[PDB]
Amino acid sequence: GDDRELAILATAENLLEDRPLADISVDDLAKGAGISRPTFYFYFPSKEAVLLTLLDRVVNQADMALQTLAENPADTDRENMWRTGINVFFETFGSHKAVTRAGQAARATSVEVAELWSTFMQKWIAYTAAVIDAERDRGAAPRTLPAHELATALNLMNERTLFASFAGEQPSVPEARVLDTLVHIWVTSIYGE
Amino acid sequence: GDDRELAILATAENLLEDRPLADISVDDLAKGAGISRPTFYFYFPSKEAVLLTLLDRVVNQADMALQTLAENPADTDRENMWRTGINVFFETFGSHKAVTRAGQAARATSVEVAELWSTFMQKWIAYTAAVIDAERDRGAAPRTLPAHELATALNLMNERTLFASFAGEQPSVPEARVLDTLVHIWVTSIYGE
Ligand SMILES: O=C(NC1=NCCS1)c1sc2cc(F)ccc2c1Cl
Ligand SMILES: O=C(NC1=NCCS1)c1sc2cc(F)ccc2c1Cl
Numbered sequence: 307g308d309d310r311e312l313a314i315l316a317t318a319e320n321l322l323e324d325r326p327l328a329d330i331s332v333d334d335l336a337k338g339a340g341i342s343r344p345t346f347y348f349y350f351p352s353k354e355a356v357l358l359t360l361l362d363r364v365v366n367q368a369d370m371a372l373q374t375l376a377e378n379p380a381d382t383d384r385e386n387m388w389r390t391g392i393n394v395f396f397e398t399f400g401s402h403k404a405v406t407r408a409g410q411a412a413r414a415t416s417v418e419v420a421e422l423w424s425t426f427m428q429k430w431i432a433y434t435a436a437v438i439d440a441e442r443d444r445g446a447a448p449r450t451l452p453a454h455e456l457a458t459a460l461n462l463m464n465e466r467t468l469f470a471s472f473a474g475e476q477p478s479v480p481e482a483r484v485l486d487t488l489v490h491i492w493v494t495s496i497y498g499e
Numbered sequence: 500g501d502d503r504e505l506a507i508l509a510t511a512e513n514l515l516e517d518r519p520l521a522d523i524s525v526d527d528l529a530k531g532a533g534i535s536r537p538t539f540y541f542y543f544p545s546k547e548a549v550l551l552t553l554l555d556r557v558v559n560q561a562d563m564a565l566q567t568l569a570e571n572p573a574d575t576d577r578e579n580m581w582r583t584g585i586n587v588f589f590e591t592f593g594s595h596k597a598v599t600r601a602g603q604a605a606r607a608t609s610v611e612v613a614e615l616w617s618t619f620m621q622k623w624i625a626y627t628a629a630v631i632d633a634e635r636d637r638g639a640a641p642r643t644l645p646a647h648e649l650a651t652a653l654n655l656m657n658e659r660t661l662f663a664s665f666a667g668e669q670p671s672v673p674e675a676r677v678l679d680t681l682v683h684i685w686v687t688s689i690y691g692e
Binding site for chain 2: 483490
C-alpha cells in the first residue's frame, strides 16, 4: 500500500541522482519499485506527479525544521541565529540535491511545482521579514530598507546561490564556502547602517 | 541580406512579448519577416538559434555598457558607483524583458545558451571582484570574505532578483524598488565589518 508508494518515491529519488526526469520512464519507476506499469498509475498519475510529491516532502522537511528553530531559540549571538536558519536550507536541500535540481527545473513546465515553490518562498520571506522587524523593534537593527523587500532579495539570493553550489554550476560558490558567504551578506545587510 | 536577418530577430523579439518560444513556429518568424520558410533556414538553423542570437546581443549590450562605465568613472560617492553599475543590468535587461525571460528558460535546454550565460557571468563576477579588491587595497573596504566568493553571491542575487522582478514572479521585489534593494545589500556587504 503505502509501502509501494514509498518504493516508487525512493526509486525516483535514486534514479534522479543519475539522469534527468526526461530520461526516466514510468517503466523505470515501476521496475525499480517492484510493480507493473498499470499498478504504478494507481499510486501516481504520472512521473511528474512523483517529482511533485518528492519536492513537497523536501520543502515541508525544511519548513518544519525552521518551525522547530523558531520555537526553540538557540542561546547564542545574532550572527549565529541567522546562520542556524540558513543552515536549515543548506542541510535539507543539500541532502536532497537530485530532487532539488529536478524540482527547480520542473518549475518552468509544471504549474503545480511552480505554485508549490511560490507558496513556501512567500512563507519563508514573511518569516524572515518578521524576524528582521523584531530585531528593529528591540533596537538591534537599523530601519533601512522595507523589511519585506530586503527579506525577498536575501531569500532569492539564497535560493539561487545554494542551488548553483549544489549543482556545481559555473559560476558558483564552493559548497564548503557557501554558508559563510550567505551569512556574511545577511548579517551585514540586516544590521548595517 | 543583413536586412532580412534583422527582420527575423525583430519579429522574434516582438512575438516573444506575447508567447513563449515553444509557441512560436519557424513559419511565424518567416511570415513576420516577410520571407518564406526555406529562406529563413538560410539565415538561421532553427528558432532556438534566433533566441541564442537575441540573447547574445543583449548580453553584449550590457557588457559593453559596463566597459564604458569602467573606462569613464563617474565623479560621485562609493554607493553611487555601485548603483550606476547595477543599473547597467537593470536598464539593459529590463529593456529586453521578453528576451531575458526566454533566454533564462533556454538555459535548461540549450548548452549554447547555458555556456553563453556562464561565460558572461564569469566575466562580470571577475570584474566585481576586481573592484572590491581595489576598494580593499585603498583602505575603503574591510578584508572580510574572499572577494571572488562575495562577488559570486552578489552577482547571483542580482540575476535571480532582477529577473524575478521583470517577470512579475510571486515572490518578487517590485521593479520600482529593486535597484535600491540591491544597492543596499551590495554596499553593506562590501563595506560592512
Ligand atoms: O535561507 C532562507 N530561505 C531560503 N534558502 C534557499 C531556498 S529559500 C532563510 S535563512 C533564515 C534565518 C532566519 F533566522 C529566519 C529565516 C530564514 C530563512 Cl527563511
Ligand atoms: O549587476 C551586476 N551583475 C549581474 N546582474 C544580473 C545579471 S548579472 C553587477 S553590478 C556592478 C557594479 C560594479 F561597480 C561592477 C560590476 C557590477 C556588476 Cl558585474
